[model samples]
Target chain A: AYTTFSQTKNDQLKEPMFFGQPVNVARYDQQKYDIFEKLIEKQLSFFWRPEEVDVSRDRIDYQALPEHEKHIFISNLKYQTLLDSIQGRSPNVALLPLISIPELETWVETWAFSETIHSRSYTHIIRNIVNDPSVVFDDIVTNEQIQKRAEGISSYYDELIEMTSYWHLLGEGTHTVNGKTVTVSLRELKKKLYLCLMSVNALEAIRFYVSFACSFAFAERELMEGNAKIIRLIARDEALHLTGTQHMLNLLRSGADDPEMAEIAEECKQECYDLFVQAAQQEKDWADYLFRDGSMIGLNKDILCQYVEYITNIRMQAVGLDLPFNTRSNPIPWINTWLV
Target chain B: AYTTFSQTKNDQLKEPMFFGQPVNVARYDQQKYDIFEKLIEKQLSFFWRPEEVDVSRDRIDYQALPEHEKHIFISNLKYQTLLDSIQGRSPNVALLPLISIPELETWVETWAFSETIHSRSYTHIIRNIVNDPSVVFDDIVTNEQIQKRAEGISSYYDELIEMTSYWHLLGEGTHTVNGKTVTVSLRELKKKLYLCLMSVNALEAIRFYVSFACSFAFAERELMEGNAKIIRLIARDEALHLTGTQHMLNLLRSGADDPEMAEIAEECKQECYDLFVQAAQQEKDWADYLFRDGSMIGLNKDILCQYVEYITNIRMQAVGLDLPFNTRSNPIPWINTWLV
Candidate 1:
């Protein structure tokens, strides 16, 4: 049931996005969903290496920033690092086995591989700006602020992965493990995947964009231009990644690939809304921490909060979820110039 | 337990290649294995789009060939397509979760991502040369010769993936599932990973080179040059990929990373040898199929078989496996001109 190359000669055009038949032959000649193929191409075209960016100037730029601004920048960078770290691995771990289309399977790997580049970009920025990078990299695990958010971000992927293992191993049945009943249902797995996509959507749509605003804010002041340049490249790729998940969610909801997934998407709307709100609220709290010492020029906690609400509204509606916040416009419209 | 992001703040430098704590923060400021970092750099530097290669002339060249030559060329392309199809997805699905260090984790994703590019390269070549690309793409799963080889290659990845899911879900224990006691042990899981790496090494090493010889054989005649150009790029990437797995096998066997892996590698020596021999034989059989209609100018079935034996012996010895074949010079000495 779980073989990499299923022996059955099935038409890939008829397979569902997930949990249909594991993709056997990788072919781009045709696609059930051409969006994935387009994404794979766009991502490959967007290929970049962190070493290409010149971040040497940022070290001097960091030494002259005000303490509050330094706190905001470093903390934001750490959060970005944490987000890409999880993203770099989780998509492949959580989604690869279940993906049934060749185009989508390659897109998943392409999208995830891009995140590793983003992760590498962060390291490049950090290593250039900070003398002791281990201090920065080390704090991401133990810092209460980052750890709390890491828990929120990684739990959805972790759970989906666990249940997926059970479903694949036992195949839709109640099983006793240590004398406890554990039921594995395909429907439940679909629900897990649906919510996981929503979580990832929030991650790319809301969490990453929020971090992007922080990165671009420094560049707005004509500082750390090198770091901002690299992040802009990252943001461009993130746009493609978010679009990929959005299309997956939309396609699944429309019953285009899997009708059960459509039901699962509908069933989990409220939970999905709650998940997005939780992530948005986490970003806002992170904003408070970023500016706790003092507010930086042209950005503050209140404005960042407003921006979170504003972006969450648009991103939520894009995926057909109810907006959790009041309608508002972009808090910092200048960020668009940096987005690519 | 399997987690997307481990909360424990352990020093990454001390982590093994596999089965250590999952990487929390993706930072490349330092690496436990500099070779992976160097490989990642080289792979990133080697990036090029398949479309960048002018494959348009291949259609004309392909249509002009004799029927037997057409058979050799098309079947060789189909086999190449199948190899990339499996190689693109299996590394990520089978290898990502078990990877522990940041450099190796990123390296695995980078390695897998590059394979997707190779996969894309096949489509470009196929679509240009065929009237109905689906006819060629669809046969990869149903073609007996292709499917036979697909089974041998995918089974290792499949078994490792299933065993991994069990290990992640149940931990180390004998669990009862539907009245059957299943044992999951870390040592057993490590052994599966070891042998799977060996199989992948053979895949990139022996299997790919055999196909390369086929591709270059046609080019030696100065026909289908576009297809040959694309394969040359693929061969270059495969060189890096094989080096990656070779390093993993050697590092583990030398007990440089995981001491338990050394024991596992020792325990699995005979099995590893057999796996490589089986793959070599499969490739040799495939050579027979490719040339069954007739032999090309430079590469016949006998020549290809000798090349398979020659390459298999060198690749096996590089990974510290017992030589499966007697020493011999490369049958096709002209491949060096094509390989970068």
Candidate 2:
């Protein structure tokens, strides 16, 4: 029920994000947060196709890698697929129906749709790189290591979605269905939304950064430059994506978009901090796994874990989470050079 | 809780178009409707940018037109802006939450996103042609002729949205709300959806065709051929769009996707006929308004009206609507001769 101009019949400018009169006008003429417009502009400016990158050289690089390096590379690719797998549909699935502003709604959809392209690009690259594609996609769910993370990510979304559907299908009430009591409360829904955003923040901020480190480390060794190039483009998009989620979280916390959201963010602050810290710790454990057998020229389990702590502080501070870690400088200072 | 993989998920091969389990995985490894895949392939094959077409010559051509001719061209462009304006957001907003299959859901979002690009292209084109772009963008709402069609197109979307929102926000029910008896029924909701899809088909099929005729008419006189070239690319995309809607409608009508939708379609048959006929008539009225001042060298009021009927009949047959018009030959067949 959102449009650019909702007709004279409804006034939606004052409605809340999740349940409001649908936007009627598509006027970018004004916005509560101009970041969406800026992101759209940045995204348009960053337009690229994976086909433009010549990954022809990566096949040789991949084959020449030691078994552990091969595991690190391929497994990181699997993890990236899962992140995009959720990113590609989550914003549209979780955010679109609840969005009140036209600009934010379209921005959320646009952001997610672009991620779908990223998801497709992965499949395109995987199909070209590996002989059997199923060997890659099948592992997304079946691999215990990856599935462990999937459970963490999907649990938050699964909870939010189920509660959302119930809230939509059945209004706020305590009802006994099949001898079980179900309560659909707006407060609980808002808490789910806040936690969901925090979980997503962890995905884009901590998880994707760890994967990018794996990618850049290869390029640092003068190997897989083409793959690194694509990763860099993806990273650039991720910067915008991260900034977007941060803005959403900030907006929600500040009560600029929805007043109740401010209370929800405050009520869930400690849990939100725990969620981010948990992701950081998981990424550190993942760092141990990425370089389990042998260390690369510039990256190893210990250094990668330090990078996780260092970047975690910056990411948390970006979203107004009070810093809990004292990790100041990146253990691998060369990461700054690669990141630049 | 749609995601990359839901172990408890239903077989996607059996889900209906809308109002089923939300789409989870975006696996193109399989698809229920190959036509959507085909349309995806076609849209990818036809990838283009407005920048590629040189519109530098259009500025000169635009200035040479008579004032009324200027009105015709600019007003038509504004109408297109309105059409795409509604279109770029409505499908995803109206259909995404209802979608159950991953490929189709992504396709709908992708399809709508591309239309937004088309909308941007219009602004690009108009910005290049006119010094005062505000005159054109502003008149889209203020002009009675254009607003008539805008209302028709938006009303169906608005109704679908309100009902779907209510359906989602408050499930099917009979209740007294705010002193009025409100009844929400699934059958009624599906009817709104069927009618909405029909209205969308008309916008893409008939209304867009009508606009294309005008754009090409300028090129017919060897004037503004560049503008026509850009529109040709748009038309190529619109072909896929109309095809997507056609497939959705046919899949629903044949009792294949959702048999209950078949009953809904059967009950709404005459209503569907009225939708197409109404859209064509509105375009005919628009045609009369476009040529009100005087006929152009290659296009006029009467022939354009015939073309409206012409497109309506062809589009009608494509979606299994009983033929509602007797118009046979395309009055502007020469326009698309080289377009394909």
Candidate 3:
């Protein structure tokens, strides 16, 4: 069911996003959906290396910051690193096998590969600012606040990947595995994939953008401008990734590619709304932690909370989910100067 | 056994290439194997968009070719496309779950992403040459000669991926899977991973270089010069990818990263030798197909077969495997001008 190269001679344009035949030939002359091809093209055009960004000034800026301000800046950077860490591997591990179209499969891989560059940028930033990066990198796993958020972020991908392994190994059926009855269902798998994508959307759209606001807020004061420049490049690439997931969600729900996905999308709407609402709440909680010591000049806990609500509604509406947050304009309009 | 984000706080520097703790953070500030980080840096510097190559001229050149020469050129292009198609996805799908360090994980993703760009380049070249690109792309699956090579190239990845699913789902021991008792062994899985890496090494080292010779041979006479430019860029990236897999094979064999992997490499020496021999023979067979109609000016069946044997021996000996072919000097020495 999930051979890397399925031998069946079939038209790629007719295949669904998933659960169709595995994509054997990688061709770009034609696409069932040109959006992925366009995304790949745009992403390639935006290719960058972190070393090209100058972050040396960030070191002195970090040393000059107030103690509580330092806490806020480092905590946000750690969370950003955590988000990219999961993203760098999850898309390919979870989505590549199920992808049936060549464009989308390559898009997923390109999207993930860009996240690794983001990961590299963080290391570049951390190395310049801190003497011992291990102290900061090590705390990502042990820090209680970051670990709490990491749990919710990774659970969906882990569950989806586990279920996919079972589905690929044993076809849809009730099977006894080590004396336990395990039932695998394609519908259930599709539903898991949908929720996983929604969760990814939240991570990229709401979560990453929230972290971006903090990075930009520092640059507004001319502090850590080097780091800000790198994050700006990161945010630019992330904009494409956000749209990629949004299109996947919208297309799946419209029955454009798979009618079953449309039904699954409808059935999971409330759950999707709830998931975004929960993620929004988590970001709010993360904001509280980031600013618990003291709020910076332009950014504070309350303003960050307002931005989360504002972005959550926009991203949710984009993906055909009911808005859980009240309609609000961009609370930090100045941040737009930083985003591409 | 497989979590998207492993919670362990172990030092990433202490991990092996596979079957250790899954990478938790994608930090590049430190690396156990600096080669991968260097490779990632080199690959990013070589980043290119396929559209950047002016393949528009290749259209007229392709159109003006004789029937037999056209068959030779397009068939060779189709074979290159198939190779990139598999290389683009297989590395990520087959290798990501088992990667234990951030540098290597990012390296694998970067390598796969570069192949996607190569895949895109083929489409760019093909679309300009022919009005109905589907006619050429469709033959990639139906072409008997190409299909024979696709099976051999993908089987290693497919086998490793299937065993990996079993290993991740059911830990080492006998387990009932769908009514039959299946045994999962870590050592056996390690051996599969080892052999798979060897197969991949041969793929990038020998198979791709063989195709490069064919593409450059066309450019030697100043025909299809635009297509040759694109292949030149692809060949540059393939050089990095080839070195990457070679380093992995050598690292595993030397007991530098994992002692178990060193033993497995030794156990599979003969099998690896046989694998390279079989691939060399297959490539020779493919040379016959490419030149069956007629030979191009600079390349033919005999010349390509000799080059295959020459490359096979060099690549095989690099990984400490016994050479399967007689030692021979450069048969296609002129191709060196085209290589990076």
Candidate 4:
């Protein structure tokens, strides 16, 4: 059985990142990986309340938008909401139980916590822009364009969580459950975890950055600056989140943390590459939907897709994956000012 | 399979707290019970970093303590660390999968995040007072005195998580796995969740407060006030956490959220009472250990036990549980100065 506090007193510094003795003591005196501790500190230092940003003027800006511009803004907002809603919960649920180190455990919790703040940011944005926020929030689950990507983004986490449950319940073995054989493999679990991390990396790095461009593009027009200021903070936080995931994936591949995971990473390289490429492809498809009615002043389907390829290539290279996109100079260089 | 974003579009305001369709959208424009949203806001408003409080003076003060007082302080600190280490991760791991309302979902994440802040505070306290924190942290799992409570306290969360895995995997049915018949019943799962909440409430409301009295007792003597300051902040957050749990238990018992959970809460009433009573007794036993080496100036075992019973009565009353002890006036009147 998985325990919140394992009774054994093991040297946490020697433990692997996951699939070891569950973290018994929450100690920060030392860590197997200090980057997680660094990230935790950085995140703590970066904390801000969503209410600190005044969105009062945003209502006026949103009210003045053409219906086509309104479609671009609200659709983009809905996608960001879906991304955070999943990011807010899945990491803690799927990853915390399997984590073996204290710093990483706390970091996972802290990461999810920051995502909750993002979730609140979306509500703040929605509530300010629309009289009935439900009309915006409600469409997130039913909109075919958003739901298509939601399924792809959420499946990796769902698979990992299910496999984790089985591993914790049955351990490594083939067991018969209700006349069917269920095989629980440690290697399989590691692959699921790897792919899940890849998918998460794509969400935080590619999908989120893609969405942020849409938000920043509005501010480039000198419209919705209140919302843009909040996104700037969110982007600063995302810079840390994507960096953390990239480190986890790179460290696992290097075999310094867990040897078998290194083997699993090698075995699953192609799938992970496709995972990132497919997400970039989805974002490009989403661009079509966001601008279907009309494009904003600074963003359109072509420019957004070009930027998506630009990001997808760099993010892929960070984790030692072969880039799927040929590459390009910055399609929207002005985004550099907003990313910071 | 549990997808992170359920595709079904449901009215979040109509969803029950748990066991409803998984919450699909992250909306806060409205809530089924606005209390959760209110708690989320209150918790966010109460955020503080442990590093914000300077514990530098604590080292000098700790160097001068008598051995017995040192035992009381360090032992008490270790116990607080254990409580938060479990709390930091378990709520999100055991509860997030079952949540159905957006307000409560975000509240659970917010509550768990606040506990992580509490966990970080422990590291800050320990790091300042000890030359080698490993000596203190390593003892947390191996100490016979602390391990007893760790197991008892973690069991409820462990059971809920295990049942949750079974419920999610095989679902609510009797299934034979590897020649053993395993039954996953929603009612039984509900019972586990109820017992888990009862255990958590006793933890925060009773066990945590008992430890707080120890912390404040030291500050009453004008020693270790920095640590006390951090504990004071922790107490403020725990107030919100306990209130959140109290509301959850009360609402579950009232049949307003889910009719079945209401029955489960009622059926599990005596067990819940025993759970609280048992936790109170454990705190009394813990007092014997904390003061075994020596007693602090303003606190000792008997007074601590009295405070435990006193708190046990009021906390139980709030949750509609019968009192286990004849309560008394505040035994540690001076300690009240530090609670705020």
> Which sections of candidate 4 miss by over 4 Å?
none
RMSD of 1: 1.4
- Model 2: per-residue Cα lDDT at residue A130: 73
Off by over 4 Å in 1: none
Model 4 residue B100 CA deviation (Å) reads 1.1
Lowest summed lDDT across 10 adjacent residues in model 3 chain A is found at: A1-10
Estimate the Cα RMSD of every predicted model relative to the unseen true structure: 1.4, 4.6, 1.2, 1.3
For every prediction, compared with the true complex, DockQ reads: 0.82, 0.23, 0.83, 0.85
Candidate scoring better on DockQ of 2 and 4 = 4
TM-score of each candidate structure, all chains considered together: 0.98, 0.82, 0.98, 0.98
lDDT of 2 by residue, B1-340 (tens): 2333464436677787788876555656566887776666556556566666788999999999998898788878877777887887788767776787767877887888788667757866887887876566656666778777777777877677667756664477875443456688988888888888888888888888888888888887888877888888888888889889888988898999888998888888888898788788888878878877887877888888888888888889888778887858877789776355
What are the lDDT scores of the predictions, listed in order?
Answer: 0.87, 0.76, 0.89, 0.88
Ranking according to DockQ, highest score first: 4, 3, 1, 2
Enumerate clash totals for all models, in the order shown. 0, 9, 0, 0
Residue-level lDDT of model 2, residues A225-259, one tens digit each, is: 77788888888888888888898888788777678
Per residue, candidate 3 scores C-alpha lDDT tens digits across A261-306 of 9999999789999999999999999888888778988899899999
lDDT of 4 by residue, B1-340 (tens): 5767787878777888988888777777788898999999998888898988999999999999998888889998999999998888888888999999989988998898888888888999999999899899889888899888889978888888888898998988889999999988998888888888888988989889988988888888889989999999999999889999999999999999889988887887888888888888888988887877777677888888889889999999999988888868888788778775
Please state the error at residue B146 of candidate 2 in Å. Answer: 3.7
Error of 1 at B242 (Å): 1.0
> True interface contacts reproduced by each model, as a fraction?
0.87, 0.15, 0.84, 0.91
Assess the local accuracy of residue A45 in candidate 2 as a C-alpha lDDT between 0 and 100: 70
Docking class of 2: acceptable
TM-score winner between 2 and 3, please give it: 3
Please provide, for model 1 over B1-340, each residue's C-alpha lDDT reduced to its tens digit, 9 standing for 90 to 100. 6899999999999999898888888889899999999999999999889988998778888899999999988898888888878878788888888888989988988988888888888888888988898888778888998777655678888899999988888889788877789999988888888888888888888888888888898898889999888888888999999999898888998987789998888888899999889988888777667878888666787887889889888988888777877888878889899997
